[PDB]
Amino acid sequence: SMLDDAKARLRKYDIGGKYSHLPYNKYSVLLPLVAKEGKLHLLFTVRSEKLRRAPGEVCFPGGKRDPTDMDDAATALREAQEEVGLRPHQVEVVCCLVPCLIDTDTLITPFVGLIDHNFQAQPNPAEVKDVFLVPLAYFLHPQVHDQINHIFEYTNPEDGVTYQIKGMTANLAVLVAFIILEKKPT
Ligand SMILES: O=C(Cc1cccc(O)c1)Nc1ccccn1
């Protein structure tokens, strides 16, 4: 099946806990996969304009590890719950992708999660201005604008709203699309 095939692909890129004990400032992100209308989508947040770090930018749910977290995957799930109301029973964490090094002292670990079909986002307005889906296949043929670094523009055909996706967020979206969608019969 589509979901079994995605999980099987994702598992081949799982690095697991290999890098998780290293003494960094630690953040986790959830790359949330949603199946709608026969296709896979990624769920993105738009950060509240109130936030000091990157107000109004598109990112994945996630945040800083805290002492309660049993592991890095727990960080991502805790933060996703706080930000968009995703409950742990509504997500299956399939794997841990390549961590992202930033600022010399920070390590961001991404987890891919399969999201339950009955989940409906409840944006927490103190943290999240908007939540939206992008079809995973979009990231294979994105609409690119050079700002000189590359920015994706995605227009939701439901309402005509355009979102800008860039940086680590855009890079991780492409990675997940390659992993899941490369080399498939039609
Ligand atoms: O803070 C995060 C996770 C993260 C961590 C490092 C980089 C990044 O782009 C994203 N995501 C968030 C925070 C508030 C509202 C929505 N989403």
mmCIF file with all atom_site columns, C-alpha atoms and ligand atoms in Angstrom:
data_model
loop_
_atom_site.group_PDB
_atom_site.id
_atom_site.type_symbol
_atom_site.label_atom_id
_atom_site.label_alt_id
_atom_site.label_comp_id
_atom_site.label_asym_id
_atom_site.label_entity_id
_atom_site.label_seq_id
_atom_site.pdbx_PDB_ins_code
_atom_site.Cartn_x
_atom_site.Cartn_y
_atom_site.Cartn_z
_atom_site.occupancy
_atom_site.B_iso_or_equiv
_atom_site.pdbx_formal_charge
_atom_site.auth_seq_id
_atom_site.auth_comp_id
_atom_site.auth_asym_id
_atom_site.auth_atom_id
_atom_site.pdbx_PDB_model_num
ATOM   1   C CA  . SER A 1 1   ? 0.000  0.000  0.000   1.00 0.00 ? 1   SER A CA  1
ATOM   2   C CA  . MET A 1 2   ? 0.949  3.695  -0.327  1.00 0.00 ? 2   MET A CA  1
ATOM   3   C CA  . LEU A 1 3   ? 1.499  4.086  3.440   1.00 0.00 ? 3   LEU A CA  1
ATOM   4   C CA  . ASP A 1 4   ? 3.335  0.786  3.881   1.00 0.00 ? 4   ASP A CA  1
ATOM   5   C CA  . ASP A 1 5   ? 5.576  1.662  0.929   1.00 0.00 ? 5   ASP A CA  1
ATOM   6   C CA  . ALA A 1 6   ? 6.383  5.142  2.409   1.00 0.00 ? 6   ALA A CA  1
ATOM   7   C CA  . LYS A 1 7   ? 7.286  3.664  5.811   1.00 0.00 ? 7   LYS A CA  1
ATOM   8   C CA  . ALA A 1 8   ? 9.438  0.949  4.206   1.00 0.00 ? 8   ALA A CA  1
ATOM   9   C CA  . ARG A 1 9   ? 11.343 3.660  2.203   1.00 0.00 ? 9   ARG A CA  1
ATOM   10  C CA  . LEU A 1 10  ? 11.743 5.944  5.221   1.00 0.00 ? 10  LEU A CA  1
ATOM   11  C CA  . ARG A 1 11  ? 13.154 3.157  7.411   1.00 0.00 ? 11  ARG A CA  1
ATOM   12  C CA  . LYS A 1 12  ? 16.145 2.764  5.058   1.00 0.00 ? 12  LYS A CA  1
ATOM   13  C CA  . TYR A 1 13  ? 17.281 6.329  5.907   1.00 0.00 ? 13  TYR A CA  1
ATOM   14  C CA  . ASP A 1 14  ? 16.737 6.052  9.690   1.00 0.00 ? 14  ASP A CA  1
ATOM   15  C CA  . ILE A 1 15  ? 19.908 7.014  11.509  1.00 0.00 ? 15  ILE A CA  1
ATOM   16  C CA  . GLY A 1 16  ? 18.246 6.165  14.879  1.00 0.00 ? 16  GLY A CA  1
ATOM   17  C CA  . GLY A 1 17  ? 19.895 7.444  18.095  1.00 0.00 ? 17  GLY A CA  1
ATOM   18  C CA  . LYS A 1 18  ? 23.453 7.501  16.700  1.00 0.00 ? 18  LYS A CA  1
ATOM   19  C CA  . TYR A 1 19  ? 23.918 11.316 17.156  1.00 0.00 ? 19  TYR A CA  1
ATOM   20  C CA  . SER A 1 20  ? 21.408 11.892 20.010  1.00 0.00 ? 20  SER A CA  1
ATOM   21  C CA  . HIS A 1 21  ? 23.780 11.874 23.058  1.00 0.00 ? 21  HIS A CA  1
ATOM   22  C CA  . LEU A 1 22  ? 26.239 14.432 21.636  1.00 0.00 ? 22  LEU A CA  1
ATOM   23  C CA  . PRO A 1 23  ? 26.500 17.503 23.920  1.00 0.00 ? 23  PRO A CA  1
ATOM   24  C CA  . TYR A 1 24  ? 24.657 20.084 21.785  1.00 0.00 ? 24  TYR A CA  1
ATOM   25  C CA  . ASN A 1 25  ? 21.855 22.576 22.382  1.00 0.00 ? 25  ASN A CA  1
ATOM   26  C CA  . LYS A 1 26  ? 19.153 20.173 21.138  1.00 0.00 ? 26  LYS A CA  1
ATOM   27  C CA  . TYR A 1 27  ? 15.996 20.845 19.053  1.00 0.00 ? 27  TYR A CA  1
ATOM   28  C CA  . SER A 1 28  ? 13.695 18.352 17.322  1.00 0.00 ? 28  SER A CA  1
ATOM   29  C CA  . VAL A 1 29  ? 11.256 18.837 14.418  1.00 0.00 ? 29  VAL A CA  1
ATOM   30  C CA  . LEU A 1 30  ? 8.350  16.705 13.262  1.00 0.00 ? 30  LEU A CA  1
ATOM   31  C CA  . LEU A 1 31  ? 7.942  16.232 9.489   1.00 0.00 ? 31  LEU A CA  1
ATOM   32  C CA  . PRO A 1 32  ? 4.261  15.310 9.560   1.00 0.00 ? 32  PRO A CA  1
ATOM   33  C CA  . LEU A 1 33  ? 2.983  13.186 6.657   1.00 0.00 ? 33  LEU A CA  1
ATOM   34  C CA  . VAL A 1 34  ? -0.783 13.344 5.969   1.00 0.00 ? 34  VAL A CA  1
ATOM   35  C CA  . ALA A 1 35  ? -2.557 11.220 3.314   1.00 0.00 ? 35  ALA A CA  1
ATOM   36  C CA  . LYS A 1 36  ? -5.445 13.145 1.578   1.00 0.00 ? 36  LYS A CA  1
ATOM   37  C CA  . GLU A 1 37  ? -7.131 12.601 -1.797  1.00 0.00 ? 37  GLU A CA  1
ATOM   38  C CA  . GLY A 1 38  ? -4.984 9.594  -2.606  1.00 0.00 ? 38  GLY A CA  1
ATOM   39  C CA  . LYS A 1 39  ? -1.622 11.466 -2.158  1.00 0.00 ? 39  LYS A CA  1
ATOM   40  C CA  . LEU A 1 40  ? 0.897  12.246 0.611   1.00 0.00 ? 40  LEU A CA  1
ATOM   41  C CA  . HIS A 1 41  ? 1.207  15.785 1.964   1.00 0.00 ? 41  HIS A CA  1
ATOM   42  C CA  . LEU A 1 42  ? 3.503  17.508 4.459   1.00 0.00 ? 42  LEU A CA  1
ATOM   43  C CA  . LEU A 1 43  ? 2.035  19.700 7.211   1.00 0.00 ? 43  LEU A CA  1
ATOM   44  C CA  . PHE A 1 44  ? 3.685  23.063 7.809   1.00 0.00 ? 44  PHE A CA  1
ATOM   45  C CA  . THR A 1 45  ? 3.160  25.866 10.351  1.00 0.00 ? 45  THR A CA  1
ATOM   46  C CA  . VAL A 1 46  ? 3.443  29.598 9.928   1.00 0.00 ? 46  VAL A CA  1
ATOM   47  C CA  . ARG A 1 47  ? 5.096  30.987 13.067  1.00 0.00 ? 47  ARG A CA  1
ATOM   48  C CA  . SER A 1 48  ? 3.221  33.662 14.999  1.00 0.00 ? 48  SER A CA  1
ATOM   49  C CA  . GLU A 1 49  ? 4.283  37.276 14.362  1.00 0.00 ? 49  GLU A CA  1
ATOM   50  C CA  . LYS A 1 50  ? 4.698  37.582 18.202  1.00 0.00 ? 50  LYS A CA  1
ATOM   51  C CA  . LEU A 1 51  ? 7.675  35.178 18.302  1.00 0.00 ? 51  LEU A CA  1
ATOM   52  C CA  . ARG A 1 52  ? 11.129 36.772 18.577  1.00 0.00 ? 52  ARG A CA  1
ATOM   53  C CA  . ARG A 1 53  ? 12.903 34.134 16.440  1.00 0.00 ? 53  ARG A CA  1
ATOM   54  C CA  . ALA A 1 54  ? 11.647 34.180 12.795  1.00 0.00 ? 54  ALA A CA  1
ATOM   55  C CA  . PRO A 1 55  ? 8.128  35.668 13.112  1.00 0.00 ? 55  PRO A CA  1
ATOM   56  C CA  . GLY A 1 56  ? 5.817  34.791 10.221  1.00 0.00 ? 56  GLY A CA  1
ATOM   57  C CA  . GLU A 1 57  ? 8.129  32.148 8.674   1.00 0.00 ? 57  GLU A CA  1
ATOM   58  C CA  . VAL A 1 58  ? 7.109  28.683 7.522   1.00 0.00 ? 58  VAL A CA  1
ATOM   59  C CA  . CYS A 1 59  ? 8.533  25.863 9.612   1.00 0.00 ? 59  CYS A CA  1
ATOM   60  C CA  . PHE A 1 60  ? 7.782  22.333 10.775  1.00 0.00 ? 60  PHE A CA  1
ATOM   61  C CA  . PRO A 1 61  ? 6.340  21.807 14.255  1.00 0.00 ? 61  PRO A CA  1
ATOM   62  C CA  . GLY A 1 62  ? 9.085  21.301 16.878  1.00 0.00 ? 62  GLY A CA  1
ATOM   63  C CA  . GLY A 1 63  ? 11.242 23.035 19.466  1.00 0.00 ? 63  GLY A CA  1
ATOM   64  C CA  . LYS A 1 64  ? 13.889 22.770 22.186  1.00 0.00 ? 64  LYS A CA  1
ATOM   65  C CA  . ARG A 1 65  ? 14.391 19.566 24.125  1.00 0.00 ? 65  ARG A CA  1
ATOM   66  C CA  . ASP A 1 66  ? 13.475 19.838 27.818  1.00 0.00 ? 66  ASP A CA  1
ATOM   67  C CA  . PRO A 1 67  ? 14.198 17.646 30.837  1.00 0.00 ? 67  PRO A CA  1
ATOM   68  C CA  . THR A 1 68  ? 10.869 15.752 30.617  1.00 0.00 ? 68  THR A CA  1
ATOM   69  C CA  . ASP A 1 69  ? 11.652 14.299 27.179  1.00 0.00 ? 69  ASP A CA  1
ATOM   70  C CA  . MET A 1 70  ? 12.600 10.605 27.233  1.00 0.00 ? 70  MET A CA  1
ATOM   71  C CA  . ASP A 1 71  ? 14.354 11.059 23.858  1.00 0.00 ? 71  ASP A CA  1
ATOM   72  C CA  . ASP A 1 72  ? 14.580 13.369 20.832  1.00 0.00 ? 72  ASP A CA  1
ATOM   73  C CA  . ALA A 1 73  ? 11.364 11.950 19.279  1.00 0.00 ? 73  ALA A CA  1
ATOM   74  C CA  . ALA A 1 74  ? 9.525  12.916 22.510  1.00 0.00 ? 74  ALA A CA  1
ATOM   75  C CA  . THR A 1 75  ? 10.659 16.535 22.031  1.00 0.00 ? 75  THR A CA  1
ATOM   76  C CA  . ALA A 1 76  ? 9.133  16.661 18.562  1.00 0.00 ? 76  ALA A CA  1
ATOM   77  C CA  . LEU A 1 77  ? 5.787  15.111 19.754  1.00 0.00 ? 77  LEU A CA  1
ATOM   78  C CA  . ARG A 1 78  ? 5.526  17.398 22.844  1.00 0.00 ? 78  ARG A CA  1
ATOM   79  C CA  . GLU A 1 79  ? 6.101  20.472 20.733  1.00 0.00 ? 79  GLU A CA  1
ATOM   80  C CA  . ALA A 1 80  ? 3.739  19.354 17.964  1.00 0.00 ? 80  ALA A CA  1
ATOM   81  C CA  . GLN A 1 81  ? 0.985  18.845 20.609  1.00 0.00 ? 81  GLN A CA  1
ATOM   82  C CA  . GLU A 1 82  ? 1.594  22.322 22.054  1.00 0.00 ? 82  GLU A CA  1
ATOM   83  C CA  . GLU A 1 83  ? 1.680  24.021 18.652  1.00 0.00 ? 83  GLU A CA  1
ATOM   84  C CA  . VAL A 1 84  ? -1.045 22.271 16.628  1.00 0.00 ? 84  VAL A CA  1
ATOM   85  C CA  . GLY A 1 85  ? -2.884 19.937 19.061  1.00 0.00 ? 85  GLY A CA  1
ATOM   86  C CA  . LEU A 1 86  ? -1.428 16.734 17.625  1.00 0.00 ? 86  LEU A CA  1
ATOM   87  C CA  . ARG A 1 87  ? -1.850 14.031 20.252  1.00 0.00 ? 87  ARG A CA  1
ATOM   88  C CA  . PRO A 1 88  ? 0.644  11.104 20.533  1.00 0.00 ? 88  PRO A CA  1
ATOM   89  C CA  . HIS A 1 89  ? -1.927 8.488  19.599  1.00 0.00 ? 89  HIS A CA  1
ATOM   90  C CA  . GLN A 1 90  ? -2.403 10.451 16.310  1.00 0.00 ? 90  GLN A CA  1
ATOM   91  C CA  . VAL A 1 91  ? 1.199  10.044 15.148  1.00 0.00 ? 91  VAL A CA  1
ATOM   92  C CA  . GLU A 1 92  ? 3.441  7.103  14.302  1.00 0.00 ? 92  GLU A CA  1
ATOM   93  C CA  . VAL A 1 93  ? 7.108  8.163  14.354  1.00 0.00 ? 93  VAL A CA  1
ATOM   94  C CA  . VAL A 1 94  ? 8.675  6.162  11.533  1.00 0.00 ? 94  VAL A CA  1
ATOM   95  C CA  . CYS A 1 95  ? 12.257 7.406  11.554  1.00 0.00 ? 95  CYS A CA  1
ATOM   96  C CA  . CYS A 1 96  ? 14.890 9.880  12.419  1.00 0.00 ? 96  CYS A CA  1
ATOM   97  C CA  . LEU A 1 97  ? 16.521 11.611 9.427   1.00 0.00 ? 97  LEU A CA  1
ATOM   98  C CA  . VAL A 1 98  ? 19.942 13.256 9.180   1.00 0.00 ? 98  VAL A CA  1
ATOM   99  C CA  . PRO A 1 99  ? 20.334 15.894 11.875  1.00 0.00 ? 99  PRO A CA  1
ATOM   100 C CA  . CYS A 1 100 ? 21.021 19.493 10.914  1.00 0.00 ? 100 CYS A CA  1
ATOM   101 C CA  . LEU A 1 101 ? 24.031 21.341 12.498  1.00 0.00 ? 101 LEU A CA  1
ATOM   102 C CA  . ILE A 1 102 ? 23.680 25.078 13.075  1.00 0.00 ? 102 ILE A CA  1
ATOM   103 C CA  . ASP A 1 103 ? 25.498 27.949 14.822  1.00 0.00 ? 103 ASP A CA  1
ATOM   104 C CA  . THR A 1 104 ? 28.411 25.668 15.912  1.00 0.00 ? 104 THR A CA  1
ATOM   105 C CA  . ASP A 1 105 ? 26.614 24.553 19.105  1.00 0.00 ? 105 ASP A CA  1
ATOM   106 C CA  . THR A 1 106 ? 23.133 23.370 17.988  1.00 0.00 ? 106 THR A CA  1
ATOM   107 C CA  . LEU A 1 107 ? 21.808 20.117 16.586  1.00 0.00 ? 107 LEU A CA  1
ATOM   108 C CA  . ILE A 1 108 ? 18.274 19.800 15.145  1.00 0.00 ? 108 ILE A CA  1
ATOM   109 C CA  . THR A 1 109 ? 17.021 16.256 14.771  1.00 0.00 ? 109 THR A CA  1
ATOM   110 C CA  . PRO A 1 110 ? 14.136 15.654 12.291  1.00 0.00 ? 110 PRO A CA  1
ATOM   111 C CA  . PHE A 1 111 ? 11.610 12.863 12.741  1.00 0.00 ? 111 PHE A CA  1
ATOM   112 C CA  . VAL A 1 112 ? 9.142  11.751 10.078  1.00 0.00 ? 112 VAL A CA  1
ATOM   113 C CA  . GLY A 1 113 ? 5.680  10.991 11.502  1.00 0.00 ? 113 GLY A CA  1
ATOM   114 C CA  . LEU A 1 114 ? 2.627  9.428  9.833   1.00 0.00 ? 114 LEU A CA  1
ATOM   115 C CA  . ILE A 1 115 ? -0.430 11.424 10.933  1.00 0.00 ? 115 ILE A CA  1
ATOM   116 C CA  . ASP A 1 116 ? -3.865 9.901  11.592  1.00 0.00 ? 116 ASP A CA  1
ATOM   117 C CA  . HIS A 1 117 ? -6.563 10.630 8.990   1.00 0.00 ? 117 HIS A CA  1
ATOM   118 C CA  . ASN A 1 118 ? -8.929 11.994 11.725  1.00 0.00 ? 118 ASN A CA  1
ATOM   119 C CA  . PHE A 1 119 ? -6.455 14.641 13.011  1.00 0.00 ? 119 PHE A CA  1
ATOM   120 C CA  . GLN A 1 120 ? -7.673 18.200 12.588  1.00 0.00 ? 120 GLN A CA  1
ATOM   121 C CA  . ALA A 1 121 ? -5.202 20.979 13.394  1.00 0.00 ? 121 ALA A CA  1
ATOM   122 C CA  . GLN A 1 122 ? -5.987 23.268 16.295  1.00 0.00 ? 122 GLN A CA  1
ATOM   123 C CA  . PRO A 1 123 ? -3.431 26.100 15.758  1.00 0.00 ? 123 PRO A CA  1
ATOM   124 C CA  . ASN A 1 124 ? -2.274 27.556 19.081  1.00 0.00 ? 124 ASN A CA  1
ATOM   125 C CA  . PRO A 1 125 ? -2.346 31.323 18.240  1.00 0.00 ? 125 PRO A CA  1
ATOM   126 C CA  . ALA A 1 126 ? 0.417  32.249 20.768  1.00 0.00 ? 126 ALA A CA  1
ATOM   127 C CA  . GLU A 1 127 ? 2.804  30.141 18.602  1.00 0.00 ? 127 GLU A CA  1
ATOM   128 C CA  . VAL A 1 128 ? 1.250  29.445 15.210  1.00 0.00 ? 128 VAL A CA  1
ATOM   129 C CA  . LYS A 1 129 ? -0.472 31.917 12.827  1.00 0.00 ? 129 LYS A CA  1
ATOM   130 C CA  . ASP A 1 130 ? -1.451 29.232 10.294  1.00 0.00 ? 130 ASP A CA  1
ATOM   131 C CA  . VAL A 1 131 ? -1.181 25.482 9.486   1.00 0.00 ? 131 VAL A CA  1
ATOM   132 C CA  . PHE A 1 132 ? -1.252 24.223 5.890   1.00 0.00 ? 132 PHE A CA  1
ATOM   133 C CA  . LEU A 1 133 ? -0.576 21.150 3.760   1.00 0.00 ? 133 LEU A CA  1
ATOM   134 C CA  . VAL A 1 134 ? 1.600  20.831 0.679   1.00 0.00 ? 134 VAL A CA  1
ATOM   135 C CA  . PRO A 1 135 ? 1.458  17.779 -1.576  1.00 0.00 ? 135 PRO A CA  1
ATOM   136 C CA  . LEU A 1 136 ? 4.764  15.926 -1.250  1.00 0.00 ? 136 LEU A CA  1
ATOM   137 C CA  . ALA A 1 137 ? 5.100  15.765 -5.063  1.00 0.00 ? 137 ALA A CA  1
ATOM   138 C CA  . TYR A 1 138 ? 5.245  19.583 -5.208  1.00 0.00 ? 138 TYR A CA  1
ATOM   139 C CA  . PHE A 1 139 ? 8.820  19.419 -3.874  1.00 0.00 ? 139 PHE A CA  1
ATOM   140 C CA  . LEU A 1 140 ? 9.926  17.552 -7.012  1.00 0.00 ? 140 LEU A CA  1
ATOM   141 C CA  . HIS A 1 141 ? 8.795  20.451 -9.249  1.00 0.00 ? 141 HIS A CA  1
ATOM   142 C CA  . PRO A 1 142 ? 8.683  23.513 -7.026  1.00 0.00 ? 142 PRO A CA  1
ATOM   143 C CA  . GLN A 1 143 ? 8.111  27.108 -8.120  1.00 0.00 ? 143 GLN A CA  1
ATOM   144 C CA  . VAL A 1 144 ? 11.489 28.640 -7.279  1.00 0.00 ? 144 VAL A CA  1
ATOM   145 C CA  . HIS A 1 145 ? 12.204 32.335 -6.654  1.00 0.00 ? 145 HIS A CA  1
ATOM   146 C CA  . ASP A 1 146 ? 15.770 33.563 -6.068  1.00 0.00 ? 146 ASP A CA  1
ATOM   147 C CA  . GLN A 1 147 ? 15.995 36.209 -3.305  1.00 0.00 ? 147 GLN A CA  1
ATOM   148 C CA  . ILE A 1 148 ? 21.144 35.002 -3.717  1.00 0.00 ? 148 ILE A CA  1
ATOM   149 C CA  . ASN A 1 149 ? 19.295 31.935 -2.267  1.00 0.00 ? 149 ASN A CA  1
ATOM   150 C CA  . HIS A 1 150 ? 16.390 29.739 -3.458  1.00 0.00 ? 150 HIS A CA  1
ATOM   151 C CA  . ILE A 1 151 ? 12.819 30.188 -2.092  1.00 0.00 ? 151 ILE A CA  1
ATOM   152 C CA  . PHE A 1 152 ? 9.813  27.959 -2.930  1.00 0.00 ? 152 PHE A CA  1
ATOM   153 C CA  . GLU A 1 153 ? 6.402  29.589 -3.489  1.00 0.00 ? 153 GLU A CA  1
ATOM   154 C CA  . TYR A 1 154 ? 3.423  27.280 -3.011  1.00 0.00 ? 154 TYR A CA  1
ATOM   155 C CA  . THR A 1 155 ? -0.085 28.478 -3.798  1.00 0.00 ? 155 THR A CA  1
ATOM   156 C CA  . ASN A 1 156 ? -2.900 26.550 -2.134  1.00 0.00 ? 156 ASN A CA  1
ATOM   157 C CA  . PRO A 1 157 ? -5.510 25.889 -4.917  1.00 0.00 ? 157 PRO A CA  1
ATOM   158 C CA  . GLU A 1 158 ? -8.272 25.757 -2.269  1.00 0.00 ? 158 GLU A CA  1
ATOM   159 C CA  . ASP A 1 159 ? -7.928 29.504 -1.496  1.00 0.00 ? 159 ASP A CA  1
ATOM   160 C CA  . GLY A 1 160 ? -5.129 31.017 -3.706  1.00 0.00 ? 160 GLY A CA  1
ATOM   161 C CA  . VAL A 1 161 ? -2.904 31.847 -0.737  1.00 0.00 ? 161 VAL A CA  1
ATOM   162 C CA  . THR A 1 162 ? 0.839  31.744 -1.514  1.00 0.00 ? 162 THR A CA  1
ATOM   163 C CA  . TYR A 1 163 ? 3.355  30.561 1.123   1.00 0.00 ? 163 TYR A CA  1
ATOM   164 C CA  . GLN A 1 164 ? 7.140  30.989 0.990   1.00 0.00 ? 164 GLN A CA  1
ATOM   165 C CA  . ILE A 1 165 ? 9.135  27.967 2.095   1.00 0.00 ? 165 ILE A CA  1
ATOM   166 C CA  . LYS A 1 166 ? 12.892 28.273 2.517   1.00 0.00 ? 166 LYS A CA  1
ATOM   167 C CA  . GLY A 1 167 ? 16.005 27.230 4.368   1.00 0.00 ? 167 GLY A CA  1
ATOM   168 C CA  . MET A 1 168 ? 16.177 24.033 6.422   1.00 0.00 ? 168 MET A CA  1
ATOM   169 C CA  . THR A 1 169 ? 12.397 23.621 6.097   1.00 0.00 ? 169 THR A CA  1
ATOM   170 C CA  . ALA A 1 170 ? 12.566 23.615 2.288   1.00 0.00 ? 170 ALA A CA  1
ATOM   171 C CA  . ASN A 1 171 ? 15.607 21.344 2.331   1.00 0.00 ? 171 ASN A CA  1
ATOM   172 C CA  . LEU A 1 172 ? 13.962 18.752 4.556   1.00 0.00 ? 172 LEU A CA  1
ATOM   173 C CA  . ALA A 1 173 ? 10.771 18.784 2.456   1.00 0.00 ? 173 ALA A CA  1
ATOM   174 C CA  . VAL A 1 174 ? 12.778 17.953 -0.669  1.00 0.00 ? 174 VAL A CA  1
ATOM   175 C CA  . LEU A 1 175 ? 14.654 15.173 1.122   1.00 0.00 ? 175 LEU A CA  1
ATOM   176 C CA  . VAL A 1 176 ? 11.430 13.503 2.285   1.00 0.00 ? 176 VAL A CA  1
ATOM   177 C CA  . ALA A 1 177 ? 9.912  13.811 -1.247  1.00 0.00 ? 177 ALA A CA  1
ATOM   178 C CA  . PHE A 1 178 ? 13.008 12.166 -2.807  1.00 0.00 ? 178 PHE A CA  1
ATOM   179 C CA  . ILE A 1 179 ? 13.008 9.345  -0.256  1.00 0.00 ? 179 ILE A CA  1
ATOM   180 C CA  . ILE A 1 180 ? 9.330  8.477  -0.652  1.00 0.00 ? 180 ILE A CA  1
ATOM   181 C CA  . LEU A 1 181 ? 8.599  9.297  -4.325  1.00 0.00 ? 181 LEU A CA  1
ATOM   182 C CA  . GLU A 1 182 ? 11.763 8.415  -6.313  1.00 0.00 ? 182 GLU A CA  1
ATOM   183 C CA  . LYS A 1 183 ? 11.675 5.412  -8.663  1.00 0.00 ? 183 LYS A CA  1
ATOM   184 C CA  . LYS A 1 184 ? 7.974  4.536  -8.539  1.00 0.00 ? 184 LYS A CA  1
ATOM   185 C CA  . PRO A 1 185 ? 5.859  2.875  -11.243 1.00 0.00 ? 185 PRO A CA  1
ATOM   186 C CA  . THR A 1 186 ? 2.715  4.812  -12.250 1.00 0.00 ? 186 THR A CA  1
HETATM 187 O O1  . LIG B 2 .   ? 10.302 25.861 16.700  1.00 0.00 ? 1   LIG B O1  1
HETATM 188 C C1  . LIG B 2 .   ? 9.921  25.075 15.841  1.00 0.00 ? 1   LIG B C1  1
HETATM 189 C C2  . LIG B 2 .   ? 10.773 23.906 15.406  1.00 0.00 ? 1   LIG B C2  1
HETATM 190 C C3  . LIG B 2 .   ? 12.006 24.352 14.677  1.00 0.00 ? 1   LIG B C3  1
HETATM 191 C C4  . LIG B 2 .   ? 13.259 24.247 15.260  1.00 0.00 ? 1   LIG B C4  1
HETATM 192 C C5  . LIG B 2 .   ? 14.383 24.653 14.567  1.00 0.00 ? 1   LIG B C5  1
HETATM 193 C C6  . LIG B 2 .   ? 14.268 25.174 13.290  1.00 0.00 ? 1   LIG B C6  1
HETATM 194 C C7  . LIG B 2 .   ? 13.019 25.268 12.696  1.00 0.00 ? 1   LIG B C7  1
HETATM 195 O O2  . LIG B 2 .   ? 12.845 25.782 11.443  1.00 0.00 ? 1   LIG B O2  1
HETATM 196 C C8  . LIG B 2 .   ? 11.898 24.859 13.391  1.00 0.00 ? 1   LIG B C8  1
HETATM 197 N N1  . LIG B 2 .   ? 8.710  25.143 15.238  1.00 0.00 ? 1   LIG B N1  1
HETATM 198 C C9  . LIG B 2 .   ? 7.622  25.955 15.592  1.00 0.00 ? 1   LIG B C9  1
HETATM 199 C C10 . LIG B 2 .   ? 7.631  26.813 16.692  1.00 0.00 ? 1   LIG B C10 1
HETATM 200 C C11 . LIG B 2 .   ? 6.506  27.565 16.931  1.00 0.00 ? 1   LIG B C11 1
HETATM 201 C C12 . LIG B 2 .   ? 5.419  27.443 16.102  1.00 0.00 ? 1   LIG B C12 1
HETATM 202 C C13 . LIG B 2 .   ? 5.496  26.567 15.046  1.00 0.00 ? 1   LIG B C13 1
HETATM 203 N N2  . LIG B 2 .   ? 6.572  25.818 14.774  1.00 0.00 ? 1   LIG B N2  1
#
